[PDB]
Amino acid sequence: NIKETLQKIKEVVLEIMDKGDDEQIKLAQSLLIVAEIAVAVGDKETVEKMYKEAKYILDNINSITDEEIKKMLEEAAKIAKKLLEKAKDLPEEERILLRIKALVIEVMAYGDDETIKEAQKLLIKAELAVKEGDLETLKKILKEMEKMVKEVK
Amino acid sequence: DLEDLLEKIKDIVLKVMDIGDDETIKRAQKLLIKAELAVENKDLKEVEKLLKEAEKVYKEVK
Numbered sequence: 001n002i003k004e005t006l007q008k009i010k011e012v013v014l015e016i017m018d019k020g021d022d023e024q025i026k027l028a029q030s031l032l033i034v035a036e037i038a039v040a041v042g043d044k045e046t047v048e049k050m051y052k053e054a055k056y057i058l059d060n061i062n063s064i065t066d067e068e069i070k071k072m073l074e075e076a077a078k079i080a081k082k083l084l085e086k087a088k089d090l091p092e093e094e095r096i097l098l099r100i101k102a103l104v105i106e107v108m109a110y111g112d113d114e115t116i117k118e119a120q121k122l123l124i125k126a127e128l129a130v131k132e133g134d135l136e137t138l139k140k141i142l143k144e145m146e147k148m149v150k151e152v153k
Numbered sequence: 154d155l156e157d158l159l160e161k162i163k164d165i166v167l168k169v170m171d172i173g174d175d176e177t178i179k180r181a182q183k184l185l186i187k188a189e190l191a192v193e194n195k196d197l198k199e200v201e202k203l204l205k206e207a208e209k210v211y212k213e214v215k
C-alpha cells in the first residue's frame with residue numbers, strides 16, 4: 001500500500017520532469033522527498049496526499065500559478081518538519097538522514113537555484129553516507145544543511 | 154549486487170551536479186529515479202543500462 005504508492009509518486013515525478021518547468025519539477029521533487037520522509041515514519045495518509053498533489057501538478061501542468069507552487073513548497077516544508085517527530089525509534093543514522101532531507105526541503109522552499117543544487121548534492125552525499133554508516137560526515141552534512149536553511153531565511 | 158550499481162550511478166549523478174548545466178542535472182536525476190524504480194522492482198538489466206547511460210552523460214560532460 002505504501003510501497004506501491006511511492007512508486008506511482010516516482011512515476012508521476014518522472015512524467016513531470018518530462019513535461020514541467022523548473023518550478024514545477026522543484027515542487028515535485030520536494031514532494032517525492034517529504035513522501036520518502038513519511039514512508040520512513042509510517043504515515044500513509046501523508047503519502048496519499050503526496051500522490052494526490054503530484055497528480056494535481058501533472059493535471060494542471062499548464063494552469064498552475066507560481067503562487068500556489070510556493071504555497072505547496074512552504075506546506076511541504078512544514079509537513080516534513082512535523083513528520084520528523086515520529087522518527088524517534090530508529091537508528092541515529094536514519095534520523096540524521098531524515099533531518100537532512102527535511103532541511104533540504106526547507107531550502108527548496110525559499111532558496112535560490114544554486115542553493116537548491118548544493119542542498120541536493122548534500123542530500124545525495126547523505127544517502128551515500130547512510131549506506132556506509134559514516135556518522136562523522138552526516139553530522140557535518142546536517143550542520144552544513146543548517147548553515148543554509150537560515151542562510152536563505 | 155544491485156546496490157553497487159546504485160552507488161555507481163548515484164556517485165555519477167552527484168558529480169554531474171557539480172559542473173553540468175541544468176539539462177544535464179535534470180537528465181541525471183531522471184536516470185537516478187529510473188534506477189531507483191528498477192532497483193525497487195528488481196531488474197538487473199535495467200539498472201545496468203541506466204548505469205551505462207549515467208557514465209554516458211558523464212562522458213558528455215568531458
Ligand SMILES: N[C@]12C[C@H]3C[C@H](C[C@H](C3)C1)C2
Binds near residue numbers: 022175
Ligand atoms: N532550474 C533548476 C531546475 C531543476 C530544479 C532545480 C535544480 C536544477 C534542476 C536546475 C532548479
Ligand SMILES: N[C@]12C[C@H]3C[C@H](C[C@H](C3)C1)C2
Binds near residue numbers: 029033120186
Ligand atoms: N533521491 C533524490 C532523487 C532526485 C535527485 C536527488 C534529490 C531528490 C530528487 C531526491 C536525490
